[PDB]
């Protein structure tokens, strides 16, 4: 039981205006659906395939290829902590341990109330200010393990 809303439909059509191939708007269509609903459900693949004209297999392959197109349900806020080499030097392990102590979950799962979903991510391009962490649209730098509990309370 899935159906694209109006605003998603004109957003996808306006992004199809940008390219000479309707296939080229698939990533942005998936991102629009993900922005509206938090993630991309099963019927969204076929609905985007219908609105673009491409087969649903290609839409599923694009949705499962990219890590930031979530094909499983996530929480209200997506915590994304960098685990790359410079933040490993700067000690991302303490930040991850503090997040595990606070949220009481493993990386990849969602809390029972659906508030936070914890995810490792690649380099955020802020290695001079490491360690970094990307909450939904906000990047946080110069992290310390004691700043995690004071920093997780601004996302209700």
């Amino acid at each position: 039981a899935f159906e694209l809303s109006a605003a998603e439909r004109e957003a996808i059509e306006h992004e199809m205006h940008h390219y000479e191939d309707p296939r080229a708007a698939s990533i942005e269509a998936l991102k629009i659906v993900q922005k509206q609903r938090g993630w991309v459900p099963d019927g969204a693949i076929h609905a985007i395939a219908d609105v673009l004209g491409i087969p649903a297999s290609d839409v599923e392959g694009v949705a499962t290829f990219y890590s930031q197109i979530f094909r499983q349900p996530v929480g209200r806020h997506v915590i994304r902590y960098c685990d790359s080499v410079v933040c490993h030097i700067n000690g991302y392990q303490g930040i991850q341990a503090a997040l595990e102590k606070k949220l009481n979950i493993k990386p990849g799962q969602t809390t029972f109330d659906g508030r936070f979903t914890l995810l490792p991510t690649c380099c955020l391009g802020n290695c001079d200010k490491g360690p970094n962490m990307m909450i939904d649209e906000d990047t946080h730098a110069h992290l310390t393990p004691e700043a995690i509990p004071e920093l997780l309370e601004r996302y209700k």
Binding site: H18, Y19, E20, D21, R23, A24, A25, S26, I27, E28, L30, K31, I54, D58, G61, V62, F65, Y66, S67, Q68, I69, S84, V85, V86, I89, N90, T121, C122, C123, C127, D128, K129, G130
Partner: protein
């Protein structure tokens, strides 16, 4: 730039039409490869392509396509404004121009500085990055990121 006569139709009275778009990615490292970038721009999975053919002859949607870094396109207006001979006379090195260099990782002042080519890595570490932090010794370094 579009409202102030710099992008769109008939730019600066010449008669040249150019439209600029921003395509926000979906978070995959392999998308930075130029042929995988072209594949991702076409709405496909970002598998790279074999070369030849190069993207200059058949790139995005089978058309001639040139893929360039941000810093190259940021170097080009200085070349077109201050001249070419000025650009060749920035440093006495075989690599013309200035590169954004810098040290990161447990140093005193990690950052990013514009330096000419030929500056040694020690000058970046002590004069700009300040050297290692308090009570820390130097063991190794990587010049160009994670893939070096």
């Amino acid at each position: 730039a579009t409202e102030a006569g710099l992008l769109g139709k008939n730019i600066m009275g010449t008669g040249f039409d150019f439209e600029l778009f921003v395509h926000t990615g979906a978070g995959r490292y392999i998308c930075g490869e130029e042929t995988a970038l072209i594949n991702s721009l076409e709405g496909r999975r970002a598998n790279p392509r074999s070369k030849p053919p190069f993207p200059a002859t058949s790139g995005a949607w089978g058309k001639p396509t040139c893929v360039n870094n941000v810093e190259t396109l940021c170097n080009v207006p200085a070349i077109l404004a201050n001249g070419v001979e000025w650009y060749q006379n920035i440093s006495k090195s075989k690599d013309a121009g200035t590169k954004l260099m810098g040290f990161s990782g447990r140093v005193k002042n990690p950052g990013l500085w514009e330096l000419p080519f030929g500056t040694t890595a020690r000058e970046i570490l002590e004069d700009y990055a300040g050297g290692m932090r308090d009570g820390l010794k130097f063991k190794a370094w990587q010049p160009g990121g994670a893939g070096t």
